[PDB]
Amino acid sequence: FPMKQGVLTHGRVRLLLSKGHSCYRPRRTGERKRKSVRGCIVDANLSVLNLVIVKKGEKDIPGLTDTTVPRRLGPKRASRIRKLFNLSKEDDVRQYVVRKPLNKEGKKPRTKAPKIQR
Amino acid sequence: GISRDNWHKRRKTGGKRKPYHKKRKYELGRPAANTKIGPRRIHTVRVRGGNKKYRALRLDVGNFSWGSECCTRKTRIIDVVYNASNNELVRTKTLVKNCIVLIDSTPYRQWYESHYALPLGRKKGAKLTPEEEEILNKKRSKKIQKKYDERKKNAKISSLLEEQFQQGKLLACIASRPGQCGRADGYVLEGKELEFYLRKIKAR
RNA sequence: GUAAUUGGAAUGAGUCCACUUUAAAUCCUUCCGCGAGGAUCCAUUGGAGGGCAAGUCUGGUGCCAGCAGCCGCGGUAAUUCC
RNA sequence: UACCUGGUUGAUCCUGCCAGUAGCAUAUGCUUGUCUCAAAGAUUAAGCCAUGCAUGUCUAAGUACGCACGGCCGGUACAGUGAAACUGCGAAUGGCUCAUUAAAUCAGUUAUGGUUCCUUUGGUCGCUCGCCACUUGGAUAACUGUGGUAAUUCUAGAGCUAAUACAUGCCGACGGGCGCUGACCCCCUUCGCGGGGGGGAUGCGUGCAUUUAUCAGUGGUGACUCUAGAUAACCUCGGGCCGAUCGCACGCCCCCCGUGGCGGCGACGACCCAUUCGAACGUCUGCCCUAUCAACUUUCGAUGGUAGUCGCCGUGCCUACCAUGGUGACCACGGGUGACGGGGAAUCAGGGUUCGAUUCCGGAGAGGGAGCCUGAGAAACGGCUACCACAUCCAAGGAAG
């Protein structure tokens, strides 16, 4: 049973959960359900805890802070591509949309670009 | 889950009637709003038809009317002074429909003086020199002085009514339904209706 | 009606190809092929004293066994049982 | 077909019941070749359920950057097919059941001289004078990569990416006009007077719907506190509207001018009015047996009055304060029902008697009660939550009925 922000009581309790809290995916609209979830205080009673770096210091740990994974889907709406490339005004956004290569071995090497919104 | 239907009432002769259906959804639960005086807390409840009524937890001002001069303004609500239904709802300052409320008099004063150019709210004198001295003389023109001397037939106030213009706090009667519309509107007492509510509140 | 001999441009129940039917099928209809003399290709359920249409035929039992909605029938010749 | 026959006696005439007689509807017994229709776990158990299922959904038109397919038709936003996911709409219908319920359900009734109600259908959507508008902002799913448990349609973290999701917000119409105010009009009678009007120097308010108050009296109903009008104002931050939406054929003016302006059929929307489908709650009249059920209701709402609280609205519907009432031998009240109501069904001189769980309509309930979410519509059960009853898996920690 996963953890939950705001329970503040170590161990496992049961919560009545609607759409939008956490830890619960509702199956029809308005369906609430009572489920058991774990507190936000950590103990030695976990099977795995999830852990996120906010700052890099000393050196390169192998497999974790190296070999940069490329961001393969860039912007789609016509406002964050204007916020990314710092286009001042009317600089033909259709020219500057990120075009991804597609690399099947049985086909000729395609490239593919999204649509544009707004 | 409190119902408001008739099938749980005893019948006219005095017979118990055994219920034939469960309590439905179209006799809806009824928590009261208990509107009192403070800063603006309004809640919304969706009702049948998808509509909304604004139940008003905590109200500050009102939209009280005057009728005889046709002067309706906002005004802040001083206090709750009388209630015909329950006497317990005036020790806790609860705003219901027909409760006798207490409002101040500063928009009515700055209307009445700005329309007739007479003093109003002043009984002793020697204090109105900074702003209330100029408002009625103003160095008007001639025909303006002609059309404002002829309003000296309707500028009377009944003696019970200008008394509460002096000490600042008019007593008004709410006509809106707060907790049901979200506003606390109404009208100011005057005349035989004021004298009726004067004799009630004093004699308590 | 005994009792037949027969047979005849008689036929189905059944058996079984082909269409039709239907979403696809099966039925029903349509039509090859076979298919009737104890046509053994077999009609049953109840009754037979009265009410109430039909036996005082024969054997068996002897107030027993049983029948009979009701009256009643049976004790050694029962139109009423088996 | 308005119909009778046998049995008390030694015989008779009667009363009286028993038996016979004919339907139809349940069950069974023996029997059963053909063919058209066809009832069918209602009565007792509204007992209990293994397993499988019975509610999902894409157009030309909300959102594809899945290589999963396509001619990647050539160096560019997308020739389209498209899985998935978000979004929207349905799941409140249909189906089954007859346990409850006796005035309850139910049935009938109500010229320029001036340049409550999603939907559907029909309306209305430049009526408002107020440094992005050639398009504003943020987040998330499918996806990718790491996982946790014995387990379930369980899900966590990390990184992307969209809208008709969730918000923010303007130009235009826009030239103005009305109402209230208001530094200059003299020409009126300035005679010392009292002056009679038009103009503006100023600053507010202006539509639709909501809330409240007042005045007057477009079109209607035996009937309105109706509709429409006018004034004074309000306008809830879980904030009322006044298109930051998607296809299709493309054109017209191109004179500011080869970069701009103007246009047709739609599709989704959208406060309100009407309509449609209803729903809700009232009026009048109508029901089986029972007195070995004659007084009942009223602390605890019983009948009414006043003021309100909530409710979609009327109402003791609920509360506060009052009045002491309402009902009854014309059967109240209590109890029973092997009571779901009706359209109907068997019977048949007329008059009646009996049946109606059962395909049509209405109602009620989804093991028994109770409470809610979402939605236009549910107190929903092939939706949730809790107790009671029964029952499922387990690695014993928990999961799902």
d(CA B154, CA B151): 6
CA B161/CA B171 separation, integer angstroms: 9
49-68 of chain B touching strand D, CB 7 A cut-off: 49-56, 63, 65-67
Q: What gap in Å lies between CA B35 and CA B21, rounded to an integer?
A: 34
- Is residue A24 within 8 Å of residue A35, measured between CB atoms? yes
- The token pair at A69 is 């994974």
- Backbone Cα Rg of chain B: 23
- CA-derived radius of gyration, chain A: 23
In the structure, how far is the CA atom of residue B185 from the C1' atom of nucleotide D214, in angstroms?
15
How many C-beta atoms surround the C-beta of residue A39 within 10 A? 16
User: Up-side HSE of residue B101: CA atoms within 13 Å toward CB?
Assistant: 35
For residue B121, report the phi and psi dihedrals to the nearest 5 degrees. Answer: 100, 5
Residue type, A53: I
Distance, first Cα to last Cα, chain B = 38
Q: How far apart are CA B68 and CA B133, in angstroms?
A: 26
Instruction: Report CA-CA distances (Å) from B139 to A103, B128, B130, B134, B172.
Output: 90, 17, 16, 9, 36
What whole-number distance in Å separates Cα of residue B16 and Cα of residue B35? 37
Q: Which two tokens stand for residue B154?
A: 């309707």
Residues 50-79/A with CB within 7 Å of nucleic chain D are: 50, 52, 71-79
Q: In 3D, which of B23, B108, B19 has the Cα closest to residue B63?
A: B108
Query: How crowded is residue B111: how many other Cβ atoms within 10 Å of its Cβ?
Result: 16
Q: What Å resolution does this PDB entry report?
A: 3.1
SS3 at position B114: helix
What is the experimental method? cryo-EM
Structure tokens at A11: 């161990």
> Is the CA virtual torsion B66, B62, B127, B141 positive or negative?
negative
d(CA B19, CA B120): 64
Output the six-digit token pair for A60: 């390169």
- Residue whose token pair is 């404002």: B148
CA of A90 to C1' of D252 (A): 27
User: How far in angstroms lies nucleotide D127's C1' from the CA of residue A100?
Assistant: 53
User: CB–CB of A45/A38 below 8 Å?
Assistant: no
The answer to whether B120 and B113 are in contact (CB under 8 A) is yes
Q: How far is the CA of A41 from the C1' of C39 (A)?
A: 100
Q: Could you check: is the Cβ of residue A88 within 7 Å of any atom of nucleic acid strand D? A: no
CA B87 to chain centre: 18
Q: A18 to each of A34, A40, A101, B11, B25, how far by Cα in Å?
A: 9, 19, 42, 43, 22
- CB-neighbour burial class of residue B59 (10 A; exposed 0-12, middle 13-18, buried 19+): buried
Instruction: Judge whether B127 and B70 are in contact, CB under 8 Å.
Output: no
CA nearest to B41, candidates B63, B55, B58: B58
Q: For residue B84, give the DSSP letter.
A: S
- Residues 21-40 of B near strand D (Cβ < 7 Å)? 21-33, 35, 40
Instruction: Kindly report the number of other CB atoms within 10 A of residue A4's CB atom.
Output: 18
- CA-nearest of B174, B179, B184, B176 to B31 is B179
Instruction: Look up residue B154 and give its DSSP letter.
Output: S
